[PDB]
């Protein structure tokens, strides 16, 4: 289970930190990612981080939000700055997991529920 926290309605230019908390075996994940959704459009790529560290993020965000992860607290953070109106959407968190790291682990996909931000002019 992915849990998040973190939304807000901020003003553009504003920034905001989004969280990502998975009831996970750390070991068992192989990269975590950002999505939004807005209404009307289909889902986006936001952000993605390797388990060593590696990012990757859409060219919406490139240079200007930052992904990061704190694996003993189970946490991923999307670190939003520079915010404008076009980032207005529900912000869902994925977990990847692959068997070979561990017994435990699952080829499986999880997610969390959705977090709004909302950000006007």
């Known amino acids: 289970q992915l849990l998040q926290s973190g939304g807000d309605s901020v003003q553009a230019g504003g920034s905001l930190r989004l969280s990502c908390v998975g009831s996970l075996y750390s070991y068992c994940i192989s990269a975590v990612s950002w999505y939004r959704q807005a209404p009307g459009k289909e889902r986006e790529f936001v952000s993605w981080?390797?388990?060593?560290?590696?990012?990757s993020y859409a060219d919406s965000v490139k240079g200007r939000f930052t992904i990061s992860q704190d694996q003993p607290k189970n946490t991923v953070y999307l670190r939003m700055n520079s915010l404008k109106p076009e980032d207005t959407a529900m912000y869902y968190c994925?977990?990847?997991?692959?068997?070979?790291?561990?017994?435990?682990?699952?080829?499986?996909?999880?997610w969390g529920q959705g977090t709004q931000v909302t950000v006007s002019s």
């Open positions: 994925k977990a990847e997991t692959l068997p070979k790291f561990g017994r435990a682990c699952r080829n499986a996909d999880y």
């Open positions: 981080i390797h388990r060593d560290g590696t990012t």
